[PDB]
Amino acid sequence: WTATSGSCKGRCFELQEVGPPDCRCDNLCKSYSSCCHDFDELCLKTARGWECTKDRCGEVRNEENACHCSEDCLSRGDCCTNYQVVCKGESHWVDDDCEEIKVPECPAGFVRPPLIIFSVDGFRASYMKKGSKVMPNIEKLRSCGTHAPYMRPVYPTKTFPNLYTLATGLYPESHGIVGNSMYDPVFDASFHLRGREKFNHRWWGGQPLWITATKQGVRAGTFFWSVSIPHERRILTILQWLSLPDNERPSVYAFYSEQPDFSGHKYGPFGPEMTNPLREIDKTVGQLMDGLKQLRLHRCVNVIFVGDHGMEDVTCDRTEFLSNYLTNVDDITLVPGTLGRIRAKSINNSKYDPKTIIAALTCKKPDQHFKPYMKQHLPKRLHYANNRRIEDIHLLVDRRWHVARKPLDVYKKCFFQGDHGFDNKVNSMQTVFVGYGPTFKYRTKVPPFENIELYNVMCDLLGLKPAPNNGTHGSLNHLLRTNTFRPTMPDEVSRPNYPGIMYLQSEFDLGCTCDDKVENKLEELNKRLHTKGSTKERHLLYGRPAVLYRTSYDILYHTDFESGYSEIFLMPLWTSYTISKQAEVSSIPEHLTNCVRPDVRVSPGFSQNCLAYKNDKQMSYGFLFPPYLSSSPEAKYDAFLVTNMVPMYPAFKRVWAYFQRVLVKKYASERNGVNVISGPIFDYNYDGLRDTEDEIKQYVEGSSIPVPTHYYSIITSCLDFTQPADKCDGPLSVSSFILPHRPDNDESCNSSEDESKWVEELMKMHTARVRDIEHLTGLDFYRKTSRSYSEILTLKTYLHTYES
Ligand SMILES: *[C@@H]1O[C@H](CO)[C@@H](O[C@@H]2O[C@H](CO)[C@@H](O[C@@H]3O[C@H](CO[C@H]4O[C@H](CO[C@H]5O[C@H](CO)[C@@H](O)[C@H](O)[C@@H]5O)[C@@H](O)[C@H](O[C@H]5O[C@H](CO)[C@@H](O)[C@H](O)[C@@H]5O[C@H]5O[C@H](CO)[C@@H](O)[C@H](O)[C@@H]5O)[C@@H]4O)[C@@H](O)[C@H](O[C@H]4O[C@H](CO)[C@@H](O)[C@H](O)[C@@H]4O[C@H]4O[C@H](CO)[C@@H](O)[C@H](O)[C@@H]4O)[C@@H]3O)[C@H](O)[C@H]2NC(C)=O)[C@H](O)[C@H]1NC(C)=O
Ligand SMILES: O=C(OCc1cc(Cl)cc(OC(F)(F)F)c1)N1C[C@@H]2CN(C(=O)c3ccc4[nH]nnc4c3)C[C@@H]2C1
Ligand SMILES: [Ca+2]
Ligand code: NA
Ligand SMILES: [Zn+2]
């Protein structure tokens, strides 16, 4: 109950939120229906408009005016944003020459450059180039400051998950806002887009920037604005706040614009109706900069222009219906649209079965515009699984399409021409980033990056220590002139053993056989050097990965590859090798097809065995270093060591064999040699983090050989491809993947065809950042390069997307 008897006299846009039963006067009280009776009268004045005209100059202060042009307004902090221009011969900020801000030029009393975040809903990355003619202010920001060609949002590319990711540095799975419309089975509660349950704090996880600031003594403006507060009034309120006394004045502010998302939904991303919303946003930006200039803050404040997601062309006629697939359509609940989430309509239904649902939605029509997934099988790069609010069954919808339950859901809810929410690697979903101010660089273009990295940088800009988040702190230091945070490499926790020859062949009882008893100090002293690591500078280019957890493992050297073999998991954690541009692919000789050889450096008790794979009818095996790429017939025998073997489903062996036989060489050819690090990943609780040994849910039948959930590879070469990978003097180039280890290829609809038609498409879908692999393996890569650590962090957050 709000007894709204109180008044907003002198409290307009107050910064402390007073609760019931006192009435509120803050920028969100409208959305709660709790404002004082006089809020509109006093706080939302509109009289005379938003601009000064020549005839208002020096006027008598009329307090009913929306903003003022009276002589005392600068002292009151409440002039119209164009006051100095109209009434004092000043120029607009946009007409001024771009001039480098080498140091902050702040008014007395300003302890640190304030941060203003100007966030725009649905601002597609291509708008920067395509709308450039109608956005002079935004274009000046972009070209004078620091900018990326685009910024990558999180999945789902919806508004709330993305805005709250911006504020927290967390994936939606971790911050808890995993979509628009959510059901929490523990709360037994529903979060609705329109309603008052969404105002319950229990939904919102992590620690948003405004809370981080407050807890560390930095004051914050209030980030959220009621829709009915017009943008001009939002800007004036921010400017008024900036004129508060030093002890009362916030250091961080946010403005939000519902455009261009609002119009883009109606008219499509490039409808001709879209030009005016872009002009208007630019005008708003112009007013802010004019206002900052009036306050002498335009060479003091750091301004971030940032979007939440883009916008794609989507229409009613591009809808798939679950009723054209399922018979039991009424037994399911569907969260519909640009993504699909499915659960049982009733929990008292023991006949509900997700396996038959997924099967009915799998590869059923030739042009099917969505793909069903159990959430744990989603590409790991989406990080969209580890939350009770994310339904087991997910549909990844093709760009430009919708999924709905039944046709009646659409025509009785064309209404729209644009939408968003698709896979965050989709070009149309990319959004913008510009930073302008003393702390950002001057006229600098930076590579595209993910929006999860921004929280750390905003904390840096404000002198704050970030809450634990999913950014990689330091990976954006190249955006900044100063304030850089100087990260150090994590300490290695486990050091390796370096085993020599300790076991005789006959001590092993692995059920393995090999036709290798085929038989001189020339090339026998030579193979001793190879087992001690003489070729190691060729195959281990960036140092050994560091093991960041407590474990027991052996470094094993070979002519063609090097591995860190885990005595705990009975397989390498990583296998490293270099394939030059001139390397030749060979075949596995007829007699060596089923060859597996004991490794005399590693005890029988810490080895796999062939018997387990013989008895396990579902499970076969593969090799991490590919026998096809051996440098010599004799070297090839190394590739058949039991310590290079890993468990693989026959269906996955199809994928893995093609990668090793065909793609690695193709990459070596294209990139002038590659270094490859491959290995297993265990993530049985789909939390994106390495499993401990007691968390493994499946072993090769009858054994302690754990079955990986995924297999990764990291493929590095020289950015300057005129230098071979193994002799690179400068920056590196990387692409990686995390392939799901599945017993079937149901994910690939063309899998009955030749691997050359479907394997590489699958791999690109499961593209990954090195950083994703670090989380999943507890390893730290690139420990020894000639590059700066910050540059390595950037490399580690890179994602090769394969968009055009
Ligand atoms: C992306 O980055 C994020 C952020 O770093 C990573 O997520 C973090 O990962 C950590 C490791 O998994 C995890 O540590 C947990 O913490 C458990 C309790 O955590 C609660 O408190 C969190 C902090 O809030 C406070 O933060 C500051 C200080 O930093 C304080 O000053 C403030 O006052 C804050 O209150 C809080 O954020 C977290 O909230 C979650 O749950 C809320 C609802 O309950 C949501 O609103 C919120 O959004 C969070 O929801 C996410 O996270 C939970 C996991 O907590 C997850 O289930 C959801 O799906 C969702 O994803 C909590 O309220 C702590 O109990 C854990 O300790 C267990 O494990 C250790 C392992 O050694 C054991 O020693 C220990 O015994 C214990 O085990 C016990 O429980 C077992 C299982 O129940 C049981 O079997 C066993 O027998 C024991 O009883 C552990 O340390 C963080 O919680 C998590 N943080 C966040 C914000 O999500 C994430 O990993 C990154 N992603 C990637 C891919 O890298
Ligand atoms: O002004 C807003 O957004 C500024 C912003 C918000 C973040 Cl989180 C990060 C940002 O970007 C960043 F971080 F980069 F600065 C910028 N919003 C205004 C709109 C109307 N609206 C609500 O009224 C609302 C909905 C749920 C709530 N739960 N609790 N209060 C709530 C209010 C939601 C919309 C978004
Ligand atoms: Ca895990
Ligand atoms: Na298939
Ligand atoms: Zn939208």
Swiss-Prot record:
Example GO molecular function: zinc ion binding
Residues annotated as catalytic: 159 (nucleophile)
Classification via SMART domains: Endonuclease_NS (SM00892), NUC (SM00477), SO (SM00201)
Regulation: Inhibited by vanadate. Inhibited by micromolar levels of bile salts, such as tauroursodeoxycholate. Not inhibited by taurodeoxycholate. Not inhibited by hydroxysterols, such as 7-hydroxycholesterol, testosterone, dexamethasone and prednisolone. Inhibited by EDTA and EGTA.
Post-translational modification: N-glycosylation, but not furin-cleavage, plays a critical role on secretion and on lysoPLD activity. The interdomain disulfide bond between Cys-363 and Cys-749 is essential for catalytic activity.
Result, substituting residue 261 to N: Abolishes lysophospholipase D activity
Keywords: Calcium, Chemotaxis, Cleavage on pair of basic residues, Disulfide bond, Glycoprotein, Hydrolase, Lipid degradation, Lipid metabolism, Metal-binding, Obesity, Repeat, Secreted, Signal, Zinc
Cofactor annotation remark: Binds 2 Zn(2+) ions per subunit.
Effect of residue 265 to Q: 20% of wild-type lysophospholipase D activity
EC code: 3.1.4.39, 3.1.4.4
Residues given in the record as 1-tetradecanoyl-sn-glycerol 3-phosphate binding sites: 159, 180, 261, 420
Residues reported in the UniProt entry to bind Zn(2+) 2: 261, 265, 420
Glycosylation site list: 3, 348, 360, 470, 750
Residues annotated to bind 1-hexadecanoyl-sn-glycero-3-phosphate: 159, 180, 261, 420
Domain text: The nuclease-like domain is most probably catalytically inactive as residues that are essential for catalysis in the DNA/RNA non-specific endonucleases are not conserved. However, it is required for the stability of the protein and the catalytic activity born by the Phosphodiesterase domain.
Family stated for the protein in its record: Belongs to the nucleotide pyrophosphatase/phosphodiesterase family.
Function as written in the Swiss-Prot or TrEMBL entry: Secreted lysophospholipase D that hydrolyzes lysophospholipids to produce the signaling molecule lysophosphatidic acid (LPA) in extracellular fluids. Its major substrate is lysophosphatidylcholine. Can also act on sphingosylphosphorylcholine producing sphingosine-1-phosphate, a modulator of cell motility. Can hydrolyze, in vitro, bis-pNPP, to some extent pNP-TMP, and barely ATP. Involved in several motility-related processes such as angiogenesis and neurite outgrowth. Acts as an angiogenic factor by stimulating migration of smooth muscle cells and microtubule formation.
The name this protein goes by in its record: Autotaxin
